[PDB]
Design an enzyme around this catalytic site. Sequence first.
Site, PDB file in Angstrom:
ATOM      1  N   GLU A  62     -31.724  26.146  16.848  1.00  0.00           N
ATOM      2  CA  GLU A  62     -31.998  27.390  16.732  1.00  0.00           C
ATOM      3  C   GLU A  62     -31.422  28.585  15.612  1.00  0.00           C
ATOM      4  O   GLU A  62     -31.440  29.400  15.833  1.00  0.00           O
ATOM      5  CB  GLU A  62     -31.099  27.695  18.168  1.00  0.00           C
ATOM      6  CG  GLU A  62     -30.034  27.223  17.657  1.00  0.00           C
ATOM      7  CD  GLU A  62     -28.570  26.998  19.162  1.00  0.00           C
ATOM      8  OE1 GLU A  62     -28.376  28.541  19.254  1.00  0.00           O
ATOM      9  OE2 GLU A  62     -28.439  25.829  19.705  1.00  0.00           O
TER      10      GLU A  62
HETATM   11  C1  LIG Z   1     -26.554  23.685  22.362  1.00  0.00           C
HETATM   12  C2  LIG Z   1     -26.458  24.370  23.031  1.00  0.00           C
HETATM   13  O1  LIG Z   1     -25.463  24.891  23.340  1.00  0.00           O
HETATM   14  N1  LIG Z   1     -26.257  25.491  21.161  1.00  0.00           N
HETATM   15  C3  LIG Z   1     -25.446  26.812  21.238  1.00  0.00           C
HETATM   16  C4  LIG Z   1     -24.425  26.938  21.259  1.00  0.00           C
HETATM   17  O2  LIG Z   1     -23.730  25.440  20.692  1.00  0.00           O
HETATM   18  C5  LIG Z   1     -22.828  27.932  21.402  1.00  0.00           C
HETATM   19  O3  LIG Z   1     -21.629  28.013  21.750  1.00  0.00           O
HETATM   20  C6  LIG Z   1     -20.809  27.697  20.802  1.00  0.00           C
HETATM   21  O4  LIG Z   1     -20.919  26.698  20.056  1.00  0.00           O
HETATM   22  C7  LIG Z   1     -19.902  26.465  19.675  1.00  0.00           C
HETATM   23  C8  LIG Z   1     -19.642  25.753  17.852  1.00  0.00           C
HETATM   24  O5  LIG Z   1     -20.589  26.155  17.566  1.00  0.00           O
HETATM   25  C9  LIG Z   1     -20.701  25.064  16.183  1.00  0.00           C
HETATM   26  O6  LIG Z   1     -21.293  24.060  15.644  1.00  0.00           O
HETATM   27  C10 LIG Z   1     -22.334  24.485  16.581  1.00  0.00           C
HETATM   28  C11 LIG Z   1     -22.941  22.395  16.998  1.00  0.00           C
HETATM   29  O7  LIG Z   1     -22.243  22.030  15.670  1.00  0.00           O
HETATM   30  C12 LIG Z   1     -23.326  24.211  15.870  1.00  0.00           C
HETATM   31  O8  LIG Z   1     -24.621  24.041  15.941  1.00  0.00           O
HETATM   32  C13 LIG Z   1     -22.854  26.197  15.451  1.00  0.00           C
HETATM   33  O9  LIG Z   1     -24.091  27.215  14.628  1.00  0.00           O
HETATM   34  C14 LIG Z   1     -21.766  26.056  15.121  1.00  0.00           C
HETATM   35  O10 LIG Z   1     -20.963  25.665  13.906  1.00  0.00           O
HETATM   36  C15 LIG Z   1     -21.622  26.032  12.686  1.00  0.00           C
HETATM   37  O11 LIG Z   1     -21.744  25.516  11.980  1.00  0.00           O
HETATM   38  C16 LIG Z   1     -22.270  26.402  10.769  1.00  0.00           C
HETATM   39  C17 LIG Z   1     -22.618  25.178   9.572  1.00  0.00           C
HETATM   40  O12 LIG Z   1     -23.787  24.042  10.242  1.00  0.00           O
HETATM   41  C18 LIG Z   1     -21.108  26.734  10.123  1.00  0.00           C
HETATM   42  O13 LIG Z   1     -21.300  27.516   8.759  1.00  0.00           O
HETATM   43  C19 LIG Z   1     -20.595  27.335   7.308  1.00  0.00           C
HETATM   44  O14 LIG Z   1     -19.102  28.008   7.834  1.00  0.00           O
HETATM   45  C20 LIG Z   1     -18.943  27.568   6.343  1.00  0.00           C
HETATM   46  C21 LIG Z   1     -17.108  26.943   6.359  1.00  0.00           C
HETATM   47  O15 LIG Z   1     -16.901  26.092   6.437  1.00  0.00           O
HETATM   48  C22 LIG Z   1     -19.145  28.263   5.703  1.00  0.00           C
HETATM   49  O16 LIG Z   1     -18.853  29.117   5.303  1.00  0.00           O
HETATM   50  C23 LIG Z   1     -20.581  28.241   4.795  1.00  0.00           C
HETATM   51  O17 LIG Z   1     -21.564  28.649   4.273  1.00  0.00           O
HETATM   52  C24 LIG Z   1     -21.448  28.127   6.597  1.00  0.00           C
HETATM   53  O18 LIG Z   1     -22.202  27.777   6.516  1.00  0.00           O
HETATM   54  C25 LIG Z   1     -20.146  27.441  10.882  1.00  0.00           C
HETATM   55  O19 LIG Z   1     -18.767  27.665  10.407  1.00  0.00           O
HETATM   56  C26 LIG Z   1     -19.962  26.442  12.121  1.00  0.00           C
HETATM   57  N2  LIG Z   1     -19.286  27.563  13.545  1.00  0.00           N
HETATM   58  C27 LIG Z   1     -18.063  26.954  14.007  1.00  0.00           C
HETATM   59  C28 LIG Z   1     -17.737  28.465  15.230  1.00  0.00           C
HETATM   60  O20 LIG Z   1     -17.242  26.008  13.240  1.00  0.00           O
HETATM   61  C29 LIG Z   1     -18.499  27.003  19.870  1.00  0.00           C
HETATM   62  O21 LIG Z   1     -16.990  27.627  19.078  1.00  0.00           O
HETATM   63  C30 LIG Z   1     -18.554  28.400  20.678  1.00  0.00           C
HETATM   64  O22 LIG Z   1     -17.327  27.690  21.793  1.00  0.00           O
HETATM   65  C31 LIG Z   1     -16.664  29.382  21.263  1.00  0.00           C
HETATM   66  O23 LIG Z   1     -17.323  30.587  21.879  1.00  0.00           O
HETATM   67  C32 LIG Z   1     -17.586  30.337  23.442  1.00  0.00           C
HETATM   68  C33 LIG Z   1     -18.656  31.304  23.728  1.00  0.00           C
HETATM   69  O24 LIG Z   1     -19.919  31.369  24.179  1.00  0.00           O
HETATM   70  C34 LIG Z   1     -16.045  30.299  24.551  1.00  0.00           C
HETATM   71  O25 LIG Z   1     -16.909  30.339  25.498  1.00  0.00           O
HETATM   72  C35 LIG Z   1     -16.232  29.572  23.895  1.00  0.00           C
HETATM   73  O26 LIG Z   1     -14.438  29.131  24.369  1.00  0.00           O
HETATM   74  C36 LIG Z   1     -14.685  29.555  23.009  1.00  0.00           C
HETATM   75  O27 LIG Z   1     -14.245  29.872  22.041  1.00  0.00           O
HETATM   76  C37 LIG Z   1     -13.421  29.151  21.109  1.00  0.00           C
HETATM   77  O28 LIG Z   1     -13.021  28.054  21.989  1.00  0.00           O
HETATM   78  C38 LIG Z   1     -12.133  26.714  21.328  1.00  0.00           C
HETATM   79  C39 LIG Z   1     -12.377  25.839  21.992  1.00  0.00           C
HETATM   80  O29 LIG Z   1     -10.229  25.330  21.453  1.00  0.00           O
HETATM   81  C40 LIG Z   1     -11.043  27.868  20.265  1.00  0.00           C
HETATM   82  O30 LIG Z   1     -10.673  26.567  19.485  1.00  0.00           O
HETATM   83  C41 LIG Z   1      -8.880  27.045  19.400  1.00  0.00           C
HETATM   84  O31 LIG Z   1      -8.719  27.852  17.686  1.00  0.00           O
HETATM   85  C42 LIG Z   1      -7.507  27.935  17.853  1.00  0.00           C
HETATM   86  C43 LIG Z   1      -7.585  28.892  16.657  1.00  0.00           C
HETATM   87  O32 LIG Z   1      -8.391  30.113  17.184  1.00  0.00           O
HETATM   88  C44 LIG Z   1      -6.897  26.217  17.391  1.00  0.00           C
HETATM   89  O33 LIG Z   1      -7.898  26.170  16.219  1.00  0.00           O
HETATM   90  C45 LIG Z   1      -6.754  25.929  18.601  1.00  0.00           C
HETATM   91  O34 LIG Z   1      -6.556  24.235  18.092  1.00  0.00           O
HETATM   92  C46 LIG Z   1      -8.549  25.262  19.051  1.00  0.00           C
HETATM   93  O35 LIG Z   1      -8.486  24.703  19.784  1.00  0.00           O
HETATM   94  C47 LIG Z   1     -11.262  29.342  19.704  1.00  0.00           C
HETATM   95  O36 LIG Z   1     -10.183  29.281  19.383  1.00  0.00           O
HETATM   96  C48 LIG Z   1     -12.194  29.959  20.693  1.00  0.00           C
HETATM   97  N3  LIG Z   1     -12.816  30.988  20.094  1.00  0.00           N
HETATM   98  C49 LIG Z   1     -13.893  31.494  19.955  1.00  0.00           C
HETATM   99  C50 LIG Z   1     -14.770  31.472  18.606  1.00  0.00           C
HETATM  100  O37 LIG Z   1     -14.239  32.288  20.517  1.00  0.00           O
HETATM  101  C51 LIG Z   1     -19.403  27.462  22.002  1.00  0.00           C
HETATM  102  O38 LIG Z   1     -19.495  26.665  22.654  1.00  0.00           O
HETATM  103  C52 LIG Z   1     -24.148  28.589  22.734  1.00  0.00           C
HETATM  104  C53 LIG Z   1     -23.604  30.873  22.467  1.00  0.00           C
HETATM  105  O39 LIG Z   1     -23.286  31.149  21.599  1.00  0.00           O
HETATM  106  O40 LIG Z   1     -25.563  28.957  22.044  1.00  0.00           O
HETATM  107  C54 LIG Z   1     -26.380  27.725  22.225  1.00  0.00           C
HETATM  108  O41 LIG Z   1     -27.435  27.921  22.173  1.00  0.00           O
END
Ligand SMILES: CC(=O)N[C@@H]1[C@@H](O)[C@H](O[C@@H]2O[C@H](CO[C@H]3O[C@H](CO)[C@@H](O)[C@H](O)[C@@H]3O[C@@H]3O[C@H](CO)[C@@H](O[C@@H]4O[C@H](CO)[C@H](O)[C@H](O)[C@H]4O)[C@H](O)[C@H]3NC(C)=O)[C@@H](O)[C@H](O[C@H]3O[C@H](CO)[C@@H](O)[C@H](O)[C@@H]3O[C@@H]3O[C@H](CO)[C@@H](O[C@@H]4O[C@H](CO)[C@H](O)[C@H](O)[C@H]4O)[C@H](O)[C@H]3NC(C)=O)[C@@H]2O)[C@@H](CO)O[C@H]1O
Length: 283
Positions: A121
């Site tokens: 996606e």
């Molecule tokens: C199968 C499916 O359902 N698909 C998707 C779902 O994935 C999606 O749900 C969300 O998923 C997020 C995770 O996504 C990342 O991982 C997946 C799997 O690998 C990837 O597919 C996705 O793309 C994301 O990865 C991203 O990867 C790219 C590269 O691969 C990274 O970019 C690179 O970054 C580098 C920098 O190093 C550089 O700049 C590069 O150039 C660049 O390309 C990118 O960084 C990376 N993204 C991330 C996020 O790492 C979940 O995070 C998300 O969950 C949050 O949001 C939902 C809303 O829908 C909330 O309900 C949920 O509560 C959550 O909020 C966060 O919760 C966490 C949990 O604890 C909290 O963490 C805490 O944070 C604190 C600090 O703030 C402390 O650290 C603490 O200890 C820690 O526990 C956080 O605070 C909350 N904050 C947020 C963000 O709100 C959700 O699950 C869905 C919905 O979009 O869509 C489906 O299609």
Amino acid sequence: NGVCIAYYITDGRNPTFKLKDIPDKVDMVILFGLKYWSLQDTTKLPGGTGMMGSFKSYKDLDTQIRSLQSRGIKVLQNIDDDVSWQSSKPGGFASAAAYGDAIKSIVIDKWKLDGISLDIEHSGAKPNPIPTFPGYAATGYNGWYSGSMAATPAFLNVISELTKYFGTTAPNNKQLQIASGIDVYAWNKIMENFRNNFNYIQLQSYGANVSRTQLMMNYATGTNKIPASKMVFGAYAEGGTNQANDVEVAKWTPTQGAKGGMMIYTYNSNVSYANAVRDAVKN
Ligand SMILES: CC(=O)N[C@@H]1[C@@H](O)[C@H](O[C@@H]2O[C@H](CO[C@H]3O[C@H](CO)[C@@H](O)[C@H](O)[C@@H]3O[C@@H]3O[C@H](CO)[C@@H](O[C@@H]4O[C@H](CO)[C@H](O)[C@H](O)[C@H]4O)[C@H](O)[C@H]3NC(C)=O)[C@@H](O)[C@H](O[C@H]3O[C@H](CO)[C@@H](O)[C@H](O)[C@@H]3O[C@@H]3O[C@H](CO)[C@@H](O[C@@H]4O[C@H](CO)[C@H](O)[C@H](O)[C@H]4O)[C@H](O)[C@H]3NC(C)=O)[C@@H]2O)[C@@H](CO)O[C@H]1O
């Protein structure tokens, strides 16, 4: 009685629910959030932080994984599609074959995991021309998810190479699954090419009701030619508000026949919600 696939996002949420706490009647767990490059080089992301937030260390992660496998639960690694898949250097490797070997080397050879699930996606070049999306009645979706990418030949090569080590035609019982939507540009071509390689094909039908999933089923089976038994729908436990619907979809048998089952995104976001879905698809 379908499969119950549990997503466990490793970002530290609901910490007391450890990966090893995945209950019974859960067939597979997909490690999510955590990226394969962290499994590849464990020194870059400190344990207990970011996508390793769910574990005290890499050793803790490794131990809990075994805990699931020894109970017979398959543990898969999530692999996200990326714009580099549309280039000749996917993942920064020299070719799709090189990329495939790497994934195999990291997920299987090194971490001895049971397979991978492709989260398809992410953004990249759109198809050209962009076909007219069939629409809601036909697919359960209104139109294209504009943030996805085209399944160009280069993109298809990646998956093709991965099917050599993961999926129904690969050796050593390794799972190859996909989590996507009929609205992603790459969907059709992925199925025209690999529907038979996937053990399960998950639709991120988050928040859907049975009617909407059936609509998806009509297309997935009739147009994409996917065997009903591979279809898995998404229970959005992370949302915590669509349980009754998810339970109904979990119990539901599509008109095309028994589905593959349900996947839960994520089991550790709300365990009670996940348990209800699990119970529903299992009993
Ligand atoms: C199968 C499916 O359902 N698909 C998707 C779902 O994935 C999606 O749900 C969300 O998923 C997020 C995770 O996504 C990342 O991982 C997946 C799997 O690998 C990837 O597919 C996705 O793309 C994301 O990865 C991203 O990867 C790219 C590269 O691969 C990274 O970019 C690179 O970054 C580098 C920098 O190093 C550089 O700049 C590069 O150039 C660049 O390309 C990118 O960084 C990376 N993204 C991330 C996020 O790492 C979940 O995070 C998300 O969950 C949050 O949001 C939902 C809303 O829908 C909330 O309900 C949920 O509560 C959550 O909020 C966060 O919760 C966490 C949990 O604890 C909290 O963490 C805490 O944070 C604190 C600090 O703030 C402390 O650290 C603490 O200890 C820690 O526990 C956080 O605070 C909350 N904050 C947020 C963000 O709100 C959700 O699950 C869905 C919905 O979009 O869509 C489906 O299609």
